[PDB]
Coordinates of C-alpha atoms in Angstrom, one line a residue:
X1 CA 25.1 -1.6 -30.1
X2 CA 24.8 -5.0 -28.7
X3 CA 23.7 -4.5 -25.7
X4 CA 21.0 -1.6 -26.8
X5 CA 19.9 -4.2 -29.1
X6 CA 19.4 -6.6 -26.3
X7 CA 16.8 -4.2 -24.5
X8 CA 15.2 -3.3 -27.8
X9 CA 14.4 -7.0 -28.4
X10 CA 13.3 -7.6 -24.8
X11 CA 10.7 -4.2 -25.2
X12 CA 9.7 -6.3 -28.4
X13 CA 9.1 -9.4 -26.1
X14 CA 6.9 -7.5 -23.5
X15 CA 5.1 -5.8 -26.6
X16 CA 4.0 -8.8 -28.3
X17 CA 3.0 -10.4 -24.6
X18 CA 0.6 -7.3 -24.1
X19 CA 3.0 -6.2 -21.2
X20 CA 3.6 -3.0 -22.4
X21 CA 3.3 -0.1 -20.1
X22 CA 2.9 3.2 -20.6
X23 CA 2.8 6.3 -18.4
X24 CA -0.4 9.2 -18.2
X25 CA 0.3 12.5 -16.8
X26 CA -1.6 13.9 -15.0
X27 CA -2.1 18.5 -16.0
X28 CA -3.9 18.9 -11.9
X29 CA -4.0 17.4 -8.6
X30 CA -5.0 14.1 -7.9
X31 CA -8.3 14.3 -7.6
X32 CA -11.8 11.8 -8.4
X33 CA -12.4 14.5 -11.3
X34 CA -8.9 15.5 -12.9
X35 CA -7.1 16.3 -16.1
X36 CA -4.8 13.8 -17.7
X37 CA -3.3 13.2 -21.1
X38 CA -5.1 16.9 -21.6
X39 CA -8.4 15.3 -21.6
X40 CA -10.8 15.7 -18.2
X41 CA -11.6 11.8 -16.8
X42 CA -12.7 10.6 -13.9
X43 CA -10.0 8.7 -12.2
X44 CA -9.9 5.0 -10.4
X45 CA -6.4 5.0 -10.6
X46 CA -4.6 6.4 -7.9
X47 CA -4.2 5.1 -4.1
X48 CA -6.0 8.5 -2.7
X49 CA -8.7 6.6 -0.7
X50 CA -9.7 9.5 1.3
X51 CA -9.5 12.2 -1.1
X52 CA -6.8 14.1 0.3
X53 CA -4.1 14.4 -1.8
X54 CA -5.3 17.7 -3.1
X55 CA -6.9 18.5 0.3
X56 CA -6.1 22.1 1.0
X57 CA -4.7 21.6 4.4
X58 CA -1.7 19.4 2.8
X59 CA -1.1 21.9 0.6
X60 CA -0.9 24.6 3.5
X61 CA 0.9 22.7 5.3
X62 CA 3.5 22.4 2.3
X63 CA 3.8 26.0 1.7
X64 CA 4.2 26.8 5.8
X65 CA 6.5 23.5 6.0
X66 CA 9.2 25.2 3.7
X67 CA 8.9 28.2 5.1
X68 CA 9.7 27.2 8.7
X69 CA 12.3 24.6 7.6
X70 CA 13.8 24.7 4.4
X71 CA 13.6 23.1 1.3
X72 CA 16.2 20.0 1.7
X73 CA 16.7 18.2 4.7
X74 CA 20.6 18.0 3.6
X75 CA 21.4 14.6 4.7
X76 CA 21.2 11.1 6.8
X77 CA 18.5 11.3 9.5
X78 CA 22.4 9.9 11.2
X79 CA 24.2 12.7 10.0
X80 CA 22.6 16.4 9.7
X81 CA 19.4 15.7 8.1
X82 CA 16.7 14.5 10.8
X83 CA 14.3 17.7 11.4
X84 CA 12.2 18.8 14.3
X85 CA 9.3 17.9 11.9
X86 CA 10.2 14.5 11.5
X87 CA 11.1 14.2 15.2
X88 CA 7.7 15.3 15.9
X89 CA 5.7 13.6 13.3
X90 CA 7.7 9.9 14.8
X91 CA 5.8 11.3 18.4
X92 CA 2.4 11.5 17.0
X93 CA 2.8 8.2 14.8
X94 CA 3.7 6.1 17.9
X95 CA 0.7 7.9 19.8
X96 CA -1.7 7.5 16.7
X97 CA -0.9 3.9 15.7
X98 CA 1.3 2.1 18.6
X99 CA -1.7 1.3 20.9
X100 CA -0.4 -2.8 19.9
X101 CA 2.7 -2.3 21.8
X102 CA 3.0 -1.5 25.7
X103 CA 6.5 0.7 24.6
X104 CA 5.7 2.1 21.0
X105 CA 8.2 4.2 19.5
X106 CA 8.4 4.9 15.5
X107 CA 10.4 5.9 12.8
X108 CA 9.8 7.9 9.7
X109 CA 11.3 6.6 6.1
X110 CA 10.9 8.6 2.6
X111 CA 9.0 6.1 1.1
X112 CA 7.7 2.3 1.8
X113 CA 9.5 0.5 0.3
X114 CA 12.4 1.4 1.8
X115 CA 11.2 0.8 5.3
X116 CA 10.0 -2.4 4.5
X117 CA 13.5 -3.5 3.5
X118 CA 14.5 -1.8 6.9
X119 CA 12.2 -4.4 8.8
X120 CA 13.1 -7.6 7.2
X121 CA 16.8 -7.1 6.6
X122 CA 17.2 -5.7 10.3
X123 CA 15.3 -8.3 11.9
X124 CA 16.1 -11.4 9.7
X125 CA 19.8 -12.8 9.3
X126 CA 21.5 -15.3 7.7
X127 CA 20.0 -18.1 10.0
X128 CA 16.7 -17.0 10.0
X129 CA 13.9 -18.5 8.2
X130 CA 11.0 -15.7 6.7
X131 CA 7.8 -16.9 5.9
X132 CA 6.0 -14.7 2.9
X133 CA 2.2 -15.0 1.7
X134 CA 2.2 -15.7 -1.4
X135 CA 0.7 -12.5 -3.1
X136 CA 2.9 -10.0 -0.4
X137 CA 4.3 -6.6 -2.4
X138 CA 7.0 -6.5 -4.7
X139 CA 9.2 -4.3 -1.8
X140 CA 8.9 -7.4 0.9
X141 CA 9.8 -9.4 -1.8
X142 CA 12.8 -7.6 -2.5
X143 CA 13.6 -7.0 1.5
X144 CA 13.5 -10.6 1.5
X145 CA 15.7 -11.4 -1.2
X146 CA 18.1 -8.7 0.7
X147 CA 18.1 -10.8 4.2
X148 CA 20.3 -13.0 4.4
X149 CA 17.3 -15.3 5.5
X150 CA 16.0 -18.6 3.7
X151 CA 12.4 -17.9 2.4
X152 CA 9.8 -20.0 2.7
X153 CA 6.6 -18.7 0.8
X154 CA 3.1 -19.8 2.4
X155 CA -0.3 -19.6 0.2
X156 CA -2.3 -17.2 0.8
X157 CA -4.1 -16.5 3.5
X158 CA -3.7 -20.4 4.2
X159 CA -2.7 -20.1 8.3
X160 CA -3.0 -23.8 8.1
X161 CA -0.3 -24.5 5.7
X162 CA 1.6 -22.0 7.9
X163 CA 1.0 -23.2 11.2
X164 CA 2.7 -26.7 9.3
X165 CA 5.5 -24.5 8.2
X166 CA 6.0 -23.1 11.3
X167 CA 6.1 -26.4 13.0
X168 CA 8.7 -27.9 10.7
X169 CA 10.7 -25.0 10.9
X170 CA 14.1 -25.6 13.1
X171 CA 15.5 -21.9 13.0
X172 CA 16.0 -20.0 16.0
X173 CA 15.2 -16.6 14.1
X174 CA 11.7 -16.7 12.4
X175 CA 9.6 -14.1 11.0
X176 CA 6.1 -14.1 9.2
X177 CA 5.8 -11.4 6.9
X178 CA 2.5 -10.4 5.3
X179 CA 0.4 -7.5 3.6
X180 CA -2.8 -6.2 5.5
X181 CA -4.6 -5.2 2.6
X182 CA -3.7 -6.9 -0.6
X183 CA -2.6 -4.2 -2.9
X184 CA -4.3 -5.9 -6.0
X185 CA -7.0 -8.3 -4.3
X186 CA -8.3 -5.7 -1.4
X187 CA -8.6 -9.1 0.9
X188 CA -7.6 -8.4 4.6
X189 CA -5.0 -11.2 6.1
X190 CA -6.2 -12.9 9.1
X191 CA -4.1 -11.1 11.5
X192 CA -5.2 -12.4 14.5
X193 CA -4.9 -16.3 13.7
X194 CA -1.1 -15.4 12.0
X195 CA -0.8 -13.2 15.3
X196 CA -1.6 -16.3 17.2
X197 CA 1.0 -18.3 15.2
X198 CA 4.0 -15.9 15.6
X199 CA 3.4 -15.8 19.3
X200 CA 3.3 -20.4 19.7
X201 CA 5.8 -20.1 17.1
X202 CA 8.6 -17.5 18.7
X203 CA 8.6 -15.6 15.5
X204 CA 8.4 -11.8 14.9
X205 CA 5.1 -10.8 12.7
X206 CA 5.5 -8.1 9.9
X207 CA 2.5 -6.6 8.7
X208 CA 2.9 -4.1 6.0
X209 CA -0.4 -2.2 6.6
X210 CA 0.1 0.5 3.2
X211 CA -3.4 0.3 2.1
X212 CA -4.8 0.4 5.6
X213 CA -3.5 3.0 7.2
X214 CA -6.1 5.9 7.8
X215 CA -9.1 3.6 6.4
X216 CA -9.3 0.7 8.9
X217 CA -9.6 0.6 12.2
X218 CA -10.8 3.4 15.0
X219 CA -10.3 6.9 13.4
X220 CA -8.3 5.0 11.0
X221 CA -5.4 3.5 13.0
X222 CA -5.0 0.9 10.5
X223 CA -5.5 -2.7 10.6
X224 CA -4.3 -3.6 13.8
X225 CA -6.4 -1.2 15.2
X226 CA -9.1 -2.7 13.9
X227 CA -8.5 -6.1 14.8
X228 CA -7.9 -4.9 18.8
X229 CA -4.8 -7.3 18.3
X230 CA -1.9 -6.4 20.9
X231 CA 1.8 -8.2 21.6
X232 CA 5.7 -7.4 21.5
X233 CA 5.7 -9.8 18.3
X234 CA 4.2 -6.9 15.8
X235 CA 6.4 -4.8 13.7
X236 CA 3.9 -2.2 12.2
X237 CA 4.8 -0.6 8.5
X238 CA 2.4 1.9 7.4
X239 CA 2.8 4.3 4.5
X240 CA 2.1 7.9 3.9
X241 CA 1.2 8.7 0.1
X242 CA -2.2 6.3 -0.1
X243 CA -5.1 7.0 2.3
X244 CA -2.8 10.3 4.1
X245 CA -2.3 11.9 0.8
X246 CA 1.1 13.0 1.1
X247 CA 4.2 10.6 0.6
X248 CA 7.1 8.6 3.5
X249 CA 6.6 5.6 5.6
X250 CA 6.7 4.5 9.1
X251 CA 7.7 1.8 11.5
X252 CA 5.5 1.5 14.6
X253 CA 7.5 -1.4 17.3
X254 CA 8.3 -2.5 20.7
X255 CA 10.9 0.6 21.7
X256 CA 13.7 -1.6 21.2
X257 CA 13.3 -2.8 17.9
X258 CA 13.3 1.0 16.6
X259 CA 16.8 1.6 18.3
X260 CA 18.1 -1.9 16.3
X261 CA 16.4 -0.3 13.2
X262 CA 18.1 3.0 13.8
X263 CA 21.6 0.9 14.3
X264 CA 21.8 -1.2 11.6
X265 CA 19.1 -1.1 8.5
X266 CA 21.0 0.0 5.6
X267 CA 17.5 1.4 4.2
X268 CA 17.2 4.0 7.0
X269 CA 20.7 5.0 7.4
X270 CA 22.2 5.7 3.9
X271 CA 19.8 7.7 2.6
X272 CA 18.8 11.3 2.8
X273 CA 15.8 12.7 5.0
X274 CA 12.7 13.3 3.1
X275 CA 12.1 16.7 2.8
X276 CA 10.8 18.3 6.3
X277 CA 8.0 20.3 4.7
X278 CA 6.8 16.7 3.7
X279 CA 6.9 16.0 7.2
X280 CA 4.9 18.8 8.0
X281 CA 2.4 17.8 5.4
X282 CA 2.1 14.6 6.7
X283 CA 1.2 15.9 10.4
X284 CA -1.8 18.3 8.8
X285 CA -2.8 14.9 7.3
X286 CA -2.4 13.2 10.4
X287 CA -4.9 15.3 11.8
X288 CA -7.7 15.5 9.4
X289 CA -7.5 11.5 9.4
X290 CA -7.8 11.0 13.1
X291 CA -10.7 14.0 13.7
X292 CA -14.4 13.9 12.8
X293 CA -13.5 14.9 9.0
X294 CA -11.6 11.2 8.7
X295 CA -14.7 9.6 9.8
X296 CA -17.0 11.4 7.8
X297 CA -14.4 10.5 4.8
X298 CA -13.8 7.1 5.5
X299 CA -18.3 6.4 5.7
X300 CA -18.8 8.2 2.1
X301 CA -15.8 5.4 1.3
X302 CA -18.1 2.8 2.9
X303 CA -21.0 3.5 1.4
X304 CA -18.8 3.8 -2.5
X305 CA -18.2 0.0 -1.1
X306 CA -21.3 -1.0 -0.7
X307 CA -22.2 0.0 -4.2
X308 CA -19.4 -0.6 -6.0
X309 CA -19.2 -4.2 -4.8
X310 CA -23.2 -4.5 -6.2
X311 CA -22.3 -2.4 -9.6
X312 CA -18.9 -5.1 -10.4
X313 CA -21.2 -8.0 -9.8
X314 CA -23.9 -7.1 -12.8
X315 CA -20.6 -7.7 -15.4
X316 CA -19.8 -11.2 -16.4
X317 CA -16.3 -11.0 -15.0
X318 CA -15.3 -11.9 -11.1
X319 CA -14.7 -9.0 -8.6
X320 CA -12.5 -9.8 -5.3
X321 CA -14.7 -10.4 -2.1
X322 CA -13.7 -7.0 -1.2
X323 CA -14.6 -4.6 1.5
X324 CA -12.1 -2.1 0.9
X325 CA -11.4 0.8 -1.5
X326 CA -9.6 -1.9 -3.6
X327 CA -12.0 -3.4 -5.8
X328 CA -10.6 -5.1 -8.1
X329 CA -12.4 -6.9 -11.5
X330 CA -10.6 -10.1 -13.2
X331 CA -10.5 -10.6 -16.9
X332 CA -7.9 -13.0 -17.6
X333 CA -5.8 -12.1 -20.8
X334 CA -3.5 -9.0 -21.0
X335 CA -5.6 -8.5 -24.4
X336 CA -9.2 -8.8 -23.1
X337 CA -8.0 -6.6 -20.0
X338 CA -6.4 -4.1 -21.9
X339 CA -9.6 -3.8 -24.4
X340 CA -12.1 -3.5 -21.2
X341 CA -9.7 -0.6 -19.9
X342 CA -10.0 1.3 -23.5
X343 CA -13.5 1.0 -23.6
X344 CA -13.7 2.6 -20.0
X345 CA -11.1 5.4 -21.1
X346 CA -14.0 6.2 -24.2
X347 CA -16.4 7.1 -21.6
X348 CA -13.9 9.2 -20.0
X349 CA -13.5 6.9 -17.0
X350 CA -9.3 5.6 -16.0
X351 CA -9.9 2.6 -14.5
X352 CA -6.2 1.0 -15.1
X353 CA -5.5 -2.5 -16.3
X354 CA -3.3 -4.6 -14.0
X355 CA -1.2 -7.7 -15.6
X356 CA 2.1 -9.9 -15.0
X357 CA 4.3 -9.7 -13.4
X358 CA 2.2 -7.9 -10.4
X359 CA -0.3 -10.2 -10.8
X360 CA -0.7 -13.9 -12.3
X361 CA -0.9 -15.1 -15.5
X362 CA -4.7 -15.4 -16.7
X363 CA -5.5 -13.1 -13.8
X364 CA -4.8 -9.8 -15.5
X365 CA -7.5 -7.4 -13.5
X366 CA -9.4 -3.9 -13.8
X367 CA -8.2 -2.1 -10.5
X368 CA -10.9 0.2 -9.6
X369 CA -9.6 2.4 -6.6
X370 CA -12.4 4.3 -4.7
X371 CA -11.5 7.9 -3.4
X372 CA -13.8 9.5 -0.2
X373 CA -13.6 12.0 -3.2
X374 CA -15.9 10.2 -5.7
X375 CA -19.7 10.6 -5.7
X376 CA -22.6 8.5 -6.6
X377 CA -23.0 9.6 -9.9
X378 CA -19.3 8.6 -10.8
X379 CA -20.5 5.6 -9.7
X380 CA -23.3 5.5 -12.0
X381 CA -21.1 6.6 -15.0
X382 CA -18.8 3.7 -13.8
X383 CA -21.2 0.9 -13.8
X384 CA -23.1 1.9 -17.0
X385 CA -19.6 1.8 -18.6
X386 CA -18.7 -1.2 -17.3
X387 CA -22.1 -3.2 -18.6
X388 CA -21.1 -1.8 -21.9
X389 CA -17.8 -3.2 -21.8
X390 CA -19.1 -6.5 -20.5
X391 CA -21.6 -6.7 -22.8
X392 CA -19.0 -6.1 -25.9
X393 CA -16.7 -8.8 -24.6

C-alpha cells in the first residue's frame, strides 16, 4: 500500500497545481471537423498541418501495404525485420530531403523520439560537450541525458550567448542541438547563423525539423530546404505522423554518419521495425506532399496564417510571432488557461491548453494547431469564440 499511496498523493499534488491531464478520444479520423468524447467539434489539437491524416491515399496505401507485406515486420531492421518498403522509403527520403549533403543517405525509425536519441547518443560521447536551446523537445532532452556528454544549455535562439559558449568550450567532440520549429512557440531557429557557428566551431549541428517537415521549404523539404543552407555538419531528423500524416521518423546525413548510426545507436538497433504497411503509407504521403496537391495544401495553410495571426491579436492575451501552423496564445496560470480552453470546448471548438512541465511556469498557453483541412469559417467560429473568452477573463 505504501508505495500506491505514494502515487496517489503525487496525482493529488498535480491536481491541486491544475496539472491534471486527461485524455479525449477521438470516435473518427483525425480530421478539422471530427467526433470526440461523442460530441462533433472542430479540432486545433492535433499536429495534422496538411490535412492528411485521413487523406484517402494513406489510407489506400494502408490497406495495399498489408496486403503486399504483412502485418508485422517481425523484428530488428538488424535482424529479420527491415522491409523492401522501408528500404525504399530510406531511397526517396534521402532524394526528397538530403539536397544539404553532397552524399545523403537516410534511415527510417518508428517514431521520433527514438531517432532523436539515435543522433545524440551516437554522435556525442563521454567527452563531448552538447549544446541545447533552451526550449528544445522533451525527446533531445532525454537523448541528451542518455549521452554520455556534458550539457551545456544555451537561451534561446541567443547565437550570441552560443557563439561565447562555443568559444569557451575545450572539448574535442561538440555538437549543437536544436528544434526547427518550436513545438509550443512555432518560432523558426536561426539555422543559418547556428550553421555558421558549428562549421568555426568544429561541431556537428542537430536540427530536429518535426514540425517542418512537409510545410517549409520547396515542396516542403523542411527547414533546411528552405533556408538553402548546405555542409557535412547537418544531421537532419524529421518526423512522419505531423505534416505527412502517417507515423516513424528519419535521419537524413553525410553517408557515413548513417553507417555509425546503423552500428551503434541503441535506439535504432534494439527495437522492432515499424510495421511495412506504415512504410508504404508513408511513401503515398511522400508523394502527395512533394506534387502540386502539397503546394496547393501548404498555401490554404498560409493563408489560415495570415488570419489566424490577425484573429489571436483582437484578445487581450499574447500570441507567438508566429508564421507557422503553430500559433500559440499565452495566458499565464494553469487556472486561467484551463477556463479559456472550456469556454472554447462550449462553442464546440478543442483548442488544448498547454502547461508545466512542457512549458514554463506563468506561461501556460492555448495551442491552436492549423490543419490545410480547416476553412475560413472555422476560423470565424474560432475568433468569435476566442473574443468571448477574452472578454470573460
Amino acid at each position: 500500500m505504501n508505495l500506491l499511496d505514494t502515487l496517489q498523493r503525487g496525482l493529488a499534488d498535480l491536481d491541486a497545481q491544475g496539472l491534471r491531464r486527461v485524455r479525449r478520444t477521438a470516435d473518427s479520423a483525425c480530421d478539422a471537423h471530427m467526433t470526440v468524447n461523442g460530441r462533433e467539434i472542430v479540432g486545433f489539437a492535433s499536429n495534422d498541418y496538411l490535412g492528411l491524416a485521413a487523406h484517402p491515399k494513406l489510407v489506400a496505401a494502408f490497406a495495399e501495404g498489408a496486403q503486399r507485406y504483412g502485418s508485422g515486420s517481425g523484428g530488428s531492421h538488424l535482424l529479420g525485420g527491415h522491409s523492401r518498403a522501408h528500404a525504399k522509403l530510406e531511397d526517396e527520403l534521402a532524394g526528397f530531403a538530403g539536397g544539404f549533403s553532397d552524399a545523403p543517405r537516410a534511415l527510417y525509425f518508428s517514431t521520433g523520439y527514438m531517432a532523436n536519441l539515435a543522433a545524440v547518443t551516437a554522435l556525442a560521447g563521454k567527452d563531448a560537450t552538447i549544446f541545447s536551446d533552451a526550449l528544445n523537445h522533451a525527446s533531445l532532452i532525454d537523448g541528451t541525458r542518455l549521452s554520455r556528454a556534458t550539457v551545456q544549455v544555451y537561451p534561446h535562439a541567443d547565437t550570441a550567448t552560443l557563439g561565447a559558449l562555443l568559444e569557451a568550450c575545450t572539448s574535442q567532440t561538440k555538437l549543437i542541438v536544436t528544434d526547427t520549429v518550436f513545438s509550443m512557440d512555432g518560432d523558426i531557429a536561426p539555422l543559418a547563423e547556428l550553421l555558421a557557428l558549428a562549421e568555426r566551431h568544429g561541431a556537428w549541428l542537430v536540427v530536429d525539423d518535426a514540425h517542418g517537415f512537409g510545410v517549409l521549404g520547396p515542396q516542403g523539404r523542411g527547414a533546411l530546404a528552405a533556408a538553402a543552407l548546405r555542409s557535412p555538419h547537418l544531421v537532419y531528423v524529421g518526423t512522419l505522423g505531423x505534416a505527412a500524416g502517417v507515423a516513424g521518423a528519419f535521419v537524413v546525413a553525410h553517408e557515413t554518419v548513417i553507417e555509425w548510426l546503423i552500428q551503434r545507436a541503441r535506439s535504432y538497433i534494439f527495437t522492432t521495425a515499424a510495421p511495412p504497411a506504415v512504410a508504404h503509407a508513408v511513401s503515398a504521403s511522400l508523394k502527395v506532399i512533394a506534387g502540386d496537391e502539397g503546394d496547393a495544401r501548404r498555401a490554404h495553410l498560409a493563408a489560415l496564417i495570415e488570419r489566424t495571426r490577425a484573429l489571436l491579436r483582437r484578445t487581450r492575451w499574447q500570441p507567438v510571432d508566429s508564421h507557422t501552423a503553430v500559433q500559440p496564445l499565452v495566458i499565464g496560470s494553469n487556472e486561467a488557461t484551463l477556463a479559456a480552453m472550456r469556454a472554447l470546448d462550449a462553442h464546440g471548438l478543442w483548442v488544448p491548453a498547454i502547461r508545466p512541465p512542457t512549458v514554463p511556469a506563468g506561461t501556460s498557453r492555448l495551442r491552436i494547431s492549423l490543419s490545410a483541412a480547416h476553412s475560413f469559417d472555422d476560423l470565424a467560429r474560432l475568433e468569435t469564440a476566442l473574443l468571448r473568452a477574452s472578454e470573460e477573463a
